[PDB]
Design a protein around this ligand. Sequence first.
Ligand code: HEM
Length: 147
Amino acid sequence: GLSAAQRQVVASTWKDIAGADNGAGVGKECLSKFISAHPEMAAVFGFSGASDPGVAELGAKVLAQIGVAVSHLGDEGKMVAEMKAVGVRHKGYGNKHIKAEYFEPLGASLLSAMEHRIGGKMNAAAKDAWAAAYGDISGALISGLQS
Ligand code: HEM
């Protein structure tokens, strides 16, 4: 779970991460940099590479879903139940062999993309709160995936 102070930091900085595009730009950079750094991951997603137009499209949907998860952090069972449902759908996505291990490096590129957009606001406490928030959001998707 998250402490009240962590949910408050996540909720507050999400407003700047969302910007004017509901975080779409952050999603594009996240997935872009992740596949560039890990080339064998293009095949796990159904993409040709980091430049595939599907990267920008999926990047927007990933970040729009985190915005929904952020609006529900105060009710943990609610947030977990909807991320599990996202997770059950992932059984049939990409190469259909999405693994739990892949979410840990993806989380690192997500925090990097966020910091790229909001700069100094993504301080030490913001990074810890978001590493914790990403741990629970992705943790709940993985449990849907392995259900
Ligand atoms: C490295 C792990 C991941 C892989 C390989 C992956 C792969 C995919 C693929 C291939 C699709 C597109 C399916 C299609 O419509 O053709 C998809 C959709 C989606 N992914 Fe993931 N994904 C990953 C992580 C995440 C994370 C961390 C989130 C969390 C917010 C997420 C949220 C979504 C959402 C919201 C969709 C749109 C469709 C739906 O709601 O099920 N994905 N993902």
